[PDB]
Design a protein around this ligand. Structure first.
Ligand SMILES: O=C(NCCS)[C@@H]1CN(Cc2ccc(F)cc2)CCN1
Length: 370
């Protein structure tokens, strides 16, 4: 592909977030920006903070325009407050363009910036509907598409232990096998529909509406695979039974406790695979995406791991757990999301992550929550 200058543009430590190099203002002030497909605001630190090494200085930028309006944005994890404005933004290792975008200048925050994360801002890649204060505040990618010839598409390859955010196209060297697409249900979050869940080839036997109770979303700005109360309970009991060859403390299945082994001795074989079936583009068709323990058990600072599946009250969140196993294509132009086996995904000599289809499924439209 012609996106070789875009490959390997992502960095970020385990459980802290993946970020891209971006510049704001004139002359260009370089900052590292969290890639977040679960929000829609572009906001950078614009005042000193204990965890910030650098921040956006508006007085040093000649192209800064004050919108003279304060903004507050709460997330599931973290919140910030700031002042709205516009300025020139560029992505050094992305498309060779410069755009005027809405930037929220973060002057106040809580549980947002992470110590040692190395990022100083957030790139909300989702749609305008879920942007604060309202959908009149144009997200960065909408600005980028409207002002340049860069196509209405981006793709993410999150690599657990870097990765690539390809803006405008698809690099074929970042995946193996075929690309399977699932329809975007609504343009707010990256809402998808899960039709079936399997733990080590065993169906959870639940009404498929439970898998999407509230919503099912694709979110790079989330560490965990988060599941609705009912689905989480059913999943944990199934994972616990499949991995009964070793006993673990009850706090481990809650993220409260860690589990450790000797270096290189980690027995991945005892932990089951997890398959999420996603609605296909063709009527009565579906495809499954299968993740390994390497994805849902994440290394902690002997090799120690944290159980990276948690419970949710706001629906299914397909986080980095899911996305680190796959090359994900956010095809906005065709209202669909693509999944392919990542070339950088962590696996062993016995098992690998999989994207397989098609599968026959009757009554798919029901699976969505109303
Ligand atoms: O609410 C949020 N995500 C959903 C909960 S998992 C995000 C959390 N993010 C910090 C963060 C992002 C990515 C990551 F890998 C680890 C941490 C700040 C913005 N809001």
């Amino acid at each position: 592909g012609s996106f070789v200058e875009m490959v390997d543009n992502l960095r970020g430590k385990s459980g802290q977030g993946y970020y891209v190099e971006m510049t704001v203002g004139s002359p260009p002030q370089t900052l590292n920006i969290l890639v977040d497909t679960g929000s829609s605001n572009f906001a950078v630190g614009a005042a000193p903070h204990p965890f910030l090494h650098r921040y956006y200085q508006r007085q040093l930028s000649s192209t800064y325009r004050d919108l003279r309006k304060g903004v507050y944005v709460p997330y599931t994890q973290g919140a910030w407050a700031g002042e709205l404005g516009t300025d020139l933004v560029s992505i050094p290792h992305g498309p060779n363009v410069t755009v005027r975008a809405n930037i929220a200048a973060i002057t106040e925050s809580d549980k947002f910036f992470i110590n040692g994360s190395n990022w100083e801002g957030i790139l909300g890649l989702a749609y305008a509907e879920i942007a604060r204060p309202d959908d009149s505040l144009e997200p960065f990618f909408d600005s980028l598409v409207k002002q340049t010839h860069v196509p209405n598409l981006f793709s993410l390859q999150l690599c657990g232990a870097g990765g690539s955010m390809i803006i405008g196209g698809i690099d074929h060297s970042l995946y193996t096998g075929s690309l399977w697409y699932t329809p975007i249900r609504r343009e707010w979050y990256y809402e998808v529909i899960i039709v079936r869940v399997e733990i080590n080839g065993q169906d959870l036997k639940m009404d498929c509406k439970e898998y999407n109770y509230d919503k099912s979303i694709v979110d790079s700005g989330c560490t965990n695979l988060r599941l609705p109360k009912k689905v989480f309970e059913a999943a944990v009991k199934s994972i616990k039974a499949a991995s009964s060859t070793e006993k673990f403390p009850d706090g481990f299945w809650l993220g409260e406790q860690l589990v450790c082994w000797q270096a290189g001795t980690t027995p991945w074989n005892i932990f089951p695979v997890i398959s999420l079936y996603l609605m296909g583009e063709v009527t009565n068709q579906s495809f499954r995406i299968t993740i390994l323990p390497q994805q849902y058990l994440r290394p902690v600072e002997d090799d120690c791991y944290k159980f990276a599946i948690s419970q949710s009250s706001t629906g299914t969140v397909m986080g980095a757990v899911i996305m680190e196993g796959f090359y994900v294509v956010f095809d906005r132009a065709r209202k669909r999301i693509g999944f392919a086996v990542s070339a950088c995904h962590v696996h062993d000599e016995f098992r690998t992550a999989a994207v397989e289809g098609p599968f026959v499924t009757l009554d798919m439209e029901d699976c969505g929550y109303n």
